[PDB]
């Protein structure tokens, strides 16, 4: 029952209720660098809770080594221990991941879990 490994409903919680105390378990679907220029890279993540995906996650720069040393990569399952929500001038919310754990490596999971659908706002 693989979707049982993920915090189904956590993305709605974060976006609808603004719940910041949960420590949800999410799957990384994709990771991409953003254009930064003369400052450290920043990574944007498409994450799943098993029900929804959400594309507006960003990694705190302190966690960059996780991506660069390939421990945090597509398909891995993570627990988020600390995150902040920030809102852009245009109204979009960005979820900044400040502390997380990898609970299962990409290589140990191997696939996108379930069939999550994009969260709409
Ligand atoms: C002002 C603000 O709210 N920003 C977030 C933000 C807040 C806080 C910390 C923060 C706090 C602590 C730390 C840390 O420790 O690192 O970081 C980070 C980001 C700045 C910002 C915003 C947009 C981008 C960007 C660019 C590119 C690109 O090129 O393609 N795309 N985006 C982008 C566009 C839309 C979304 Cl929904 C997302 Cl997730 C990213 C980029 C930046």
CATH code (residue 63): 2.40.50.140
Tell me how far the alpha carbon of residue 86 lies from the centroid of ligand 1, in angstroms: 9
Atom of ligand 1 nearest to the CA of 36: 29
Tell me which method was used to determine the 3D structure.
X-ray
Whose Cα sits closest to atom 41 in ligand 1?
34
CB neighbours of residue 49 within 10 Å: 25
- What are all long-range contacts of 80-87, with beta carbons under 8 Å and residues at least 24 apart? 80/23, 80/24, 80/25, 80/26, 81/23, 83/14, 83/20, 84/20, 85/14, 85/18, 85/20
Tally of structural domains, the chain:
1
- Tell me the C-alpha distance between 78 and 92, whole Å: 24
Tell me how far the alpha carbon of residue 58 lies from the centroid of ligand 1, in angstroms: 6
Tell me how far the alpha carbon of residue 2 lies from the centroid of ligand 1, in angstroms: 31
Full residue range of the structural domain in which residue 39 is found: 1-121
């Amino acid at each position: 029952h693989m979707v049982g490994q993920l915090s189904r409903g956590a993305i709605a919680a974060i976006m609808q209720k603004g719940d910041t105390n949960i420590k949800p378990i999410l799957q990384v679907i994709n990771i991409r660098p953003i254009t930064t220029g003369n400052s450290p890279p920043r990574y944007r993540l498409l994450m799943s809770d098993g029900l929804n995906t959400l594309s507006s996650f960003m990694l705190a720069t302190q966690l960059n080594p996780l991506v660069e040393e390939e421990q945090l990569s597509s398909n891995c399952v993570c627990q988020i221990h600390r995150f902040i929500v920030n809102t852009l001038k245009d109204g979009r919310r960005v979820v900044i991941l400040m502390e997380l754990e990898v609970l299962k490596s990409a290589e140990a999971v191997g696939v996108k879990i379930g069939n999550p659908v994009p969260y709409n706002e």
